[PDB]
Structures are given as structure tokens and as C-alpha cells.
Amino acid sequence: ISPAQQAQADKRARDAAAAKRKQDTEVSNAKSREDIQYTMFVSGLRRGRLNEFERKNRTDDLAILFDSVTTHTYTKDYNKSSYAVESKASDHVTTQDGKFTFSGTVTDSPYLIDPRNMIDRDTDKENPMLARRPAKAIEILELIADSHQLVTLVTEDNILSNYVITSFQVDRSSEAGSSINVQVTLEEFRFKRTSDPKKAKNANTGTKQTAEDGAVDDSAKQKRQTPYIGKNAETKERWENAAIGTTD
């Protein structure tokens, strides 16, 4: 070995570590703000669903439209006891979470570039292929799934809410070049501070200990006491030490 390599291993570690700080940071802030609401438009649009598509702005109610959706399926499940009941005892049944899946595609040669779509936030009007639209979609897709957003689906018949993404697939086969096939799967979510005191309810926090690195917690960790900034050291000083004392 030689120092020339030590100046090279550091580069290998530094650049690789920088990748997490980018990806890992973005998800953190994406979860630190609940105002944004994502929505997806699978079919539906031209049969009067435009009434609510126009409601979507470019800052809070982001909308996603795929260049084409081939199929989408919706299904629910139930189960019942397999043993004869004692007799009416109609409570021997349970409801499972409904599933939703669909297949789509994103192409380098779009036919409709409506700017309201969040995929086309800043896409060039005259050169769609240099905008690299398929890469734009994937970057959006991972962030939504990673942050665990409660997505809302607008479909042909009904509207579904509180659906989370559990898996998706992307591939670029030899056929259909210059495009990507996308599959998604979603399931229901049976979800159940600054608040109005009139809405407040008695809460609990269990047993609690010394809170945060304070003037007393510092002593426990052997940290040196934080010096006091001398904005005023004439009034409190005579009283602070006499009445509150010092950690010792």
C-alpha cells in the first residue's frame, strides 16, 4: 500500500456516504410535513372526472397521470368459520383489506403534456425526449412509497382513499424500447400538538425522567454546566443560588 491509496479509499467512502445524506434526507422532510396530499388518476378522466382534476394545484394537491394504463383490478376478501355454527349467530365472519393493482407505461414520446401533471412540472415543450420523462416518474414514485403517503385513487367507477403502496416493478425490455412498464399494488388502511382546548382529552405519558440535556442532566453525563450569558447578573444571582441552589 501507499498514502496515494489512503487518499483514494477516503474518496470511495466519502462519495458513497454522500448518497445516503441525499436520499435519506429527502424522505425525512417528506414525512415531516403532512399538508401535501398525493393523488393518482387511473382512467376516469374523460368521463366527467375532469370536474375534480382541475381542483388540483401545483403545491398541495399534487396529481399523477400515466401516459397509458392498460388494466386495473379491484378486489375484496372475507373469511368465515369452517366449523358448523351453534345457531342467529351471523357474527362468524370478518372483512379483509381490499387490494388494488394496475399496469401502466411511461414513454419518451408523449402525446399529451398537460402541465398540471406533476410528472410534467418542468418538461420542455419541443424536446420531450431530452427531458427524460421516465426518469422523472421513478424519482417521484420512490419518494411517495418511501414516505408512506396515504394515496387517493380516482378510478372509472368509484373513488378510493387511504391506500398505501406495498410494491411496484419497473423494467425496460427489448420490445417497446424508449419506454418503461410499471406495475403498482395498493391496500386499504384502517387508520383510527396544536389543538383546540375544547377538543382536548385527558392523555398520558407514563413515567418520565429528567427531560433533555438540562442543568441537571449535564451533571449526570459529566458535561460541564453551560455558562450563563450576562444579560443581567444582579437580580437573579442573589435569589437563584439561595432558592434553587446548584447541582452538586
Binding site: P197, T210, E212, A215, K231, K236, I244
Partner: protein, 112 residues
């Protein structure tokens, strides 16, 4: 009456917080209620699982809260005070209570 600082408190601002704390090796339960018109915190103190709180009082800065109540077997004998870390004129608020939020609610125990 020598006394030593031995505990500090923090409040998340929720109007009906309730939690259990241990002081002087004894355990107590505390309730904090926020008053809108008077913009002040109301503190209730009592034993664990007690039917009713033993002491109820209004929190204020530089006032000895427990002063008139050191004659009961279930009340701490230490000192409970609220004093500010910033400008001395700041009065207790909703979100400004904590080790670094501006107001330092603290408990100190006599040396025995």
C-alpha cells in the same frame, strides 16, 4: 435551608397533559390544564390512583408553589419554582416551558 437542584420538567403544550413523576424516591402523578381566558397553566398534584388530587394551584414565575402545603405526609418538602432563562420580564406561556424554550420549571430538594 440548603437545597440542591435535582429535577427539571418539560411540557409539550397539549392542553390536558398527565404523567407520573418520581421525586425524593416517592412517586406522584401530575395533571396540567391550560386556561384560555387566563392564559395560564393549572397544576394538580396527588397520589397514584388517588380519587381526587391533593393540591391544585396556578403556576406563576418566582412564586413558591408548595409554600403553604409543607404540612402533609404526601407533599414533597422541596422547592418548586418557575424562572425564565431569557429576559426577566417574560411570563409563563403555553409553548415556552422547558429547559431551552424560555422558562425553566425546576424542583430542588433539601439536603437530608
Amino acid at each position: 435551608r440548603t437545597v440542591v437542584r435535582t429535577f427539571d420538567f418539560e411540557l409539550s403544550g397539549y392542553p390536558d397533559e398527565t404523567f407520573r413523576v418520581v421525586l425524593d424516591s416517592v412517586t406522584y402523578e401530575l395533571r396540567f390544564m391550560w386556561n384560555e381566558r387566563d392564559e395560564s397553566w393549572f397544576m394538580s398534584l396527588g397520589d397514584i390512583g388517588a380519587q381526587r388530587p391533593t393540591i391544585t394551584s396556578k403556576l406563576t414565575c418566582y412564586s413558591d408553589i408548595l409554600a403553604p402545603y409543607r404540612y402533609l405526609d404526601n407533599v414533597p418538602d422541596g422547592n418548586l419554582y418557575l424562572w425564565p432563562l431569557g429576559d426577566i420580564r417574560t411570563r409563563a406561556g403555553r409553548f415556552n416551558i422547558g429547559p431551552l424554550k424560555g422558562i425553566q420549571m425546576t424542583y430542588s430538594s433539601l439536603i437530608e
